[PDB]
Amino acid sequence: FPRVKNWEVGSITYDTLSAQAQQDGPCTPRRCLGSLVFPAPEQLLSQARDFINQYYSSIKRSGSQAHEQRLQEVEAEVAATGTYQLRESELVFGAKQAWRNAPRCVGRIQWGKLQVFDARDCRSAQEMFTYICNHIKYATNRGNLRSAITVFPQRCPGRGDFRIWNSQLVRYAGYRQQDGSVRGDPANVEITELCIQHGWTPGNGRFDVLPLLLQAPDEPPELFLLPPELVLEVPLEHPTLEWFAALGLRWYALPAVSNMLLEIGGLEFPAAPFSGWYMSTEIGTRNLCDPHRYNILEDVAVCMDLDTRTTSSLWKDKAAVEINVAVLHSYQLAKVTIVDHHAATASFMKHLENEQKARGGCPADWAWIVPPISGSLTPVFHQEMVNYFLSPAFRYQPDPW
Amino acid sequence: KFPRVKNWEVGSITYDTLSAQAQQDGPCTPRRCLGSLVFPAPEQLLSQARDFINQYYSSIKRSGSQAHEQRLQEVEAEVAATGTYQLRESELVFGAKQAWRNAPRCVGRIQWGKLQVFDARDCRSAQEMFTYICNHIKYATNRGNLRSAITVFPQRCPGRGDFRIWNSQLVRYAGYRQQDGSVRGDPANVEITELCIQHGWTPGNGRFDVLPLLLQAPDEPPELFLLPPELVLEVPLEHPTLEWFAALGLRWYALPAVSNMLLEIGGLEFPAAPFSGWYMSTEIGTRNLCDPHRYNILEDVAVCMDLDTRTTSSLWKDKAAVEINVAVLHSYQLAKVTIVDHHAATASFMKHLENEQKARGGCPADWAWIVPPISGSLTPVFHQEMVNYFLSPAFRYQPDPW
C-alpha cells in the first residue's frame, strides 16, 4: 500500500483503494508517463457482477434477496442476449461513481449531488435534441448552476451509436481566415468545418455559438440550432480597469462536456453529456490566455501599460491575474455560479479527507488537480497523490468521423 | 515500443528511446502512478563501473578503441585486488556533468556542459575541507556573476568513515524556536540550528543569521566553522515601486549550494560533493518567502498592498505573490547578482529538450518539478509531455549523518 504525505500538515495516509485498480495505466517501474494527456461475453459478465456487487455493498444490502435476484437476472439476460440493462437506481449510482472516480476532476466534493436524466428510451436525433435542451435548461437554472448528466442509449453490437459530434454542448465557432489565422476559438476549426459542410450558415463574430451535430444510430449527423435564450453568456468586465469591458470579451455559463464515453458495469454509453460549473482559471487562463486559444494576454498587457519587452517584469503574470479577477467579478456580478481555484482546491482537500474514511483513498492526477496559475499557493500543491483507474469511469473515445 | 511524447502547444512529436537505458526502478507500476512522491558485491560494482566506462568512451567517440579496452581491464583488476577503483580526473569531470544532465527535477540543465569541477579527493581533515569549501563559494559567487561549480571530496571507501557536510546548504539562515511556539528565522532550519548550538555555536537572534558549517572528517565528530561574512553575498530585497517593501527587512543570499546529496559515479559514491548554481526567482519569492512553513510573508504583503484578504475571490494571494517575485528579480538585478526568471528558465529548458533529443534520443524530466510554482500554464513546459526515469551518474538523497 502506498504511503501518501501532506507536506504542509505533516500528515500521513495509506491508499488502500488503489489495490482495486481495474485496468492498467501507462507507467512502469522503468519510466513514469504521468504527464501524458492520452495514455468476450465472459468479460462483460465479470464486470456486470463486479458492478452489481459494488451497488449492493454501497447500500449495505450485500447477500440480500434482492441482491441475489439481480445477479440472477443479469446472468440470464447476458446469456440470452449478450448484454443487459441497468435499473434506473443503478444508473444513478453508476454515473455518480464515475464522477467520483475521475482522477483529473478537482470538483469532486460535489459528487453526491448530481442529477441524472434517463434518456435511454431516445429514438431519433430530433428527440435527442429535446433531451439536450432540457438538460441545458435544468443545469443553467438562470445562473444558479446545477450539476447534471443525460444518459442516452447504450452501445450494443451490430448497431450504430448515438453520438454528439461536438466536444462541448456550448462552443464558439472558429473561422479560418485568408492568411492562415483564426477568427474565434481556434480549438474548434475542425468542428466548425463539419458544421458548414452540413448546411450551416456561418457568421463572422468572435463568439458565435456553434450548432449541435447529433447522430442517431446508423443515421448521418443532423444539424440543430440551439435557441439563443438557452445559452446563458457573461460579458467580461473588470472591477477597476474600466477599459476591460471595451475588449468585448465574453464566455458562456455552462461547461457541458459531450464527447466522453460513460462505462458502467461493462456497458458503454457513448452519448452521455454532463455539466457542472466553471473554475475561473479554466476561463481566464486556459480559454483566454493559452497561445492556441484566444491568446489575449499581450493585448491586455498593452492596455495595462506594462513593460512587455522583458520577461522579468512579470507582465505575463500580472496580466494573467487581472484576467482571472475579471472572470470572477463578471460571473458574480451576473449571478452565474463560479468558483475560484483557491476555494476549489480547499474543497478538494476536504474531499480527500472524506474519501480516506469512506473508501481508504482517492485517485487523483496531480498535474490536473494543481491549478494552472498560483499552483504552490493552494493546499493541493504539497499534497502527494496516487493515480489509478477505477470503474465506473468516464473515458475518451475516438472521434465519430 | 518507445514512449511517444507530444508538445500540445506546437503539435510536435518525439519518441523517447533513452528511457530504455533506465538503470533503476521508480515507484510507478501499471496499476498506479506515484510520480508525485517527493522521496520515492564485486560484480554489482563491476557492472556499474563497466557501464560508466562505456558511457565515457562513447562520449569522446572512442568506443572499442584500445584505450577503452585497456581502461576496462584496469578497472576490473583494481576492483579484484582492492574492492574499489579510482576515477581518472577526466572521467570524474564527465561523471559530475552527467549527474547534473540526468537530474530529472532540474530546470536549469541547458548549462550542464559548463560545470566547473573541483577535485578535492586528496582532502584529509575538516580544516582542509573548510578551505576547499571557502574556495568553492568564492569561485561560484564571483562577486555576483555566478558560476556553476561542484567540489567532490574523497569517495566512500570501506575501512574509513565518510566525509560529510551536515548542513543541507552551504548558506542557510538560522531558525530559532520562540517560547510562544513560533520560529524566528527560517523554520526549515530549526534542527540544524539546534545542532550548531550543541556543538558550540553562539547563536544570534535575528531573522537572517547565517549558520556556521558543521564538517565531518572520517571517523571524527563534526567541527564548527564560521563563514567569513565577506564570503556570503546577500541581497537586500526591495520593490521598484512599493517603497514600504524594504521596511519588511527581507534579504536572501546569492548562492544556492546544495551540500547533502550523494554523487554516484560508476558504482562509486561521493557522500560529500557540494554543488551550486544560481537561483530561479520563484525559488526565493514563492518557495522560501511565501510557503506557510517558511518565512510566510504572503498575507502581510497583501495587507500592505491594501488588498481584501477576507475572501479568496479577490485573488489577493496571487497578486501578492507576483509582487514578491517582482521584488526578488528587481533586487538581484540592482545588486548585479545573477538570477533567472521562470519564463526565461523554462524557455531555455525547452531548448535543452531539443538538444537532448538530438544527442541522446530523450531527456528525463519530472513534470511536477519542472513547471514553476506560479504561472505554470504561462510557460512552454506546461503543455509539454515529459518522461521521468533514473539514469546514472546521478545525484541522490542520503540519510542524515546524525
Ligand code: HEM
Ligand atoms: C460541479 C463543478 C465542477 C467543477 C468545478 C469541475 C472542475 C473540473 C476541472 C477544473 C477539471 C480540469 C480542467 C482542465 O484541466 O482542463 C475537470 C475535469 C473533469 N471533470 Fe470536473 N468539474 C465539475 C463537475 C463535474 C461533473 C458534474 C462531472 C461528471 C459527472 C465532472 C467530471 C470531470 C472529468 C471526467 C474530468 C476529466 C476530463 C478529461 O480528463 O478530459 N466534473 N473538472
Ligand code: HEM
Ligand atoms: C545553473 C543554474 C541552475 C538553476 C537555475 C537550477 C534550478 C533548479 C530548480 C528550480 C530546481 C528545483 C528546486 C525546487 O523545485 O524546489 C533544481 C533542482 C535540482 N538541481 Fe538545478 N539549477 C541550477 C544548477 C544546478 C547544478 C549546477 C546542479 C548540479 C551539478 C543542479 C542539480 C539539481 C538537482 C539534483 C536538483 C533536484 C534535487 C532534488 O531532486 O530534490 N542544478 N534546480
Ligand SMILES: Cc1cc(N)nc2cc(-c3ccc(CCN)cc3)ccc12
Ligand atoms: C464538467 C466540467 C466542469 C468544469 N468546470 N470543467 C470541466 C473541464 C473539462 C475538461 C477536460 C479536459 C480538457 C482538455 C482535453 N483533454 C478540457 C476540459 C471537462 C469537464 C468539466
Ligand SMILES: Cc1cc(N)nc2cc(-c3ccc(CCN)cc3)ccc12
Ligand atoms: C501536462 C498537462 C497538465 C494539465 N493540467 N493540462 C494539460 C492540458 C493539455 C492539453 C492542451 C491542449 C488540448 C487540446 C486538445 N484536446 C488538450 C490538452 C496538455 C497537457 C496538460
Ligand SMILES: Cc1cc(N)nc2cc(-c3ccc(CCN)cc3)ccc12
Ligand atoms: C543547484 C540548485 C540551483 C537552484 N537554483 N536551485 C536548486 C534547488 C535545489 C532543491 C532541491 C530540493 C529541494 C526540496 C527538497 N527535495 C529544494 C531545492 C537543489 C539545487 C539547486
Ligand SMILES: Cc1cc(N)nc2cc(-c3ccc(CCN)cc3)ccc12
Ligand atoms: C508535489 C510537489 C511538487 C513540487 N514541485 N515540489 C514539492 C515540494 C514538496 C516539499 C515541500 C517542503 C519540503 C520541506 C521538507 N523537507 C519538502 C518538499 C512537496 C511536494 C512537492
Ligand SMILES: [Gd]
Ligand atoms: Gd431487458
Ligand SMILES: [Gd]
Ligand atoms: Gd491610456
Ligand SMILES: [Gd]
Ligand atoms: Gd510608490
Ligand SMILES: [Zn+2]
Ligand atoms: Zn507514473
Ligand SMILES: [Zn+2]
Ligand atoms: Zn492550457
Ligand SMILES: [Zn+2]
Ligand atoms: Zn513549496
